[PDB]
C-alpha cells in the first residue's frame, strides 16, 4: 500500500535517511508528522525517506 517512490537524489542528513536513487520505490514501514518517514528503499535498507519530493506515499 505505502510505496513512496524517490524522485531526486537525497542523501541522509538526520540519522538513517535512505539515500534516494530516484526510481526505486520506498515502502513506509512507519510515518510521522514530518516529511521523512521510516521506509525501506528498494535497496533493502530501512531509513528515513523524504516525502516532500519522491512520489506515491507522502
From Swiss-Prot:
Domain named SH3: residues: 1-58
Q: List the disulfide bonds.
A: none
Expression sites (tissue/organ): Predominantly expressed in B-lymphocytes.
| Mutation effect (residue 8 to F) | Loss of phosphorylation of GTF2I
| Localization | Cytoplasm; Cell membrane; Nucleus; Membrane raft
Which residues are modified to Phosphotyrosine?
A: 8
Domain writeup: The PH domain mediates the binding to inositol polyphosphate and phosphoinositides, leading to its targeting to the plasma membrane. It is extended in the BTK kinase family by a region designated the TH (Tec homology) domain, which consists of about 80 residues preceding the SH3 domain.
What quaternary arrangement does the UniProt entry report? Part of a complex composed of EEIG1, TNFRSF11A/RANK, PLCG2, GAB2, TEC and BTK; complex formation increases in the presence of TNFSF11/RANKL. Binds GTF2I through the PH domain. Interacts with SH3BP5 via the SH3 domain. Interacts with IBTK via its PH domain. Interacts with ARID3A, CAV1, FASLG, PIN1, TLR8 and TLR9. Interacts with MPL/TPOR.
Linked disorder reads: X-linked agammaglobulinemia: Humoral immunodeficiency disease which results in developmental defects in the maturation pathway of B-cells. Affected boys have normal levels of pre-B-cells in their bone marrow but virtually no circulating mature B-lymphocytes. This results in a lack of immunoglobulins of all classes and leads to recurrent bacterial infections like otitis, conjunctivitis, dermatitis, sinusitis in the first few years of life, or even some patients present overwhelming sepsis or meningitis, resulting in death in a few hours.
Its biological purpose: Non-receptor tyrosine kinase indispensable for B lymphocyte development, differentiation and signaling. Binding of antigen to the B-cell antigen receptor (BCR) triggers signaling that ultimately leads to B-cell activation. After BCR engagement and activation at the plasma membrane, phosphorylates PLCG2 at several sites, igniting the downstream signaling pathway through calcium mobilization, followed by activation of the protein kinase C (PKC) family members. PLCG2 phosphorylation is performed in close cooperation with the adapter protein B-cell linker protein BLNK.
Tell me the protein family, please: Belongs to the protein kinase superfamily. Tyr protein kinase family. TEC subfamily.
The identity of this protein, by name, is: Tyrosine-protein kinase BTK
Taxonomic source organism: Homo sapiens
Gene this protein is translated from: BTK
Amino acid at each position: 500500500l505505502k510505496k513512496v517512490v524517490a524522485l531526486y537524489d537525497y542523501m541522509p542528513m538526520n540519522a538513517n535517511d535512505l539515500q534516494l536513487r530516484k526510481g526505486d520505490e520506498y515502502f513506509i514501514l512507519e510515518e510521522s508528522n514530518l516529511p521523512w518517514w521510516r521506509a525501506r528503499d528498494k535497496n533493502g535498507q530501512e531509513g528515513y525517506i523524504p516525502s516532500n519530493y519522491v512520489t506515491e506515499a507522502e
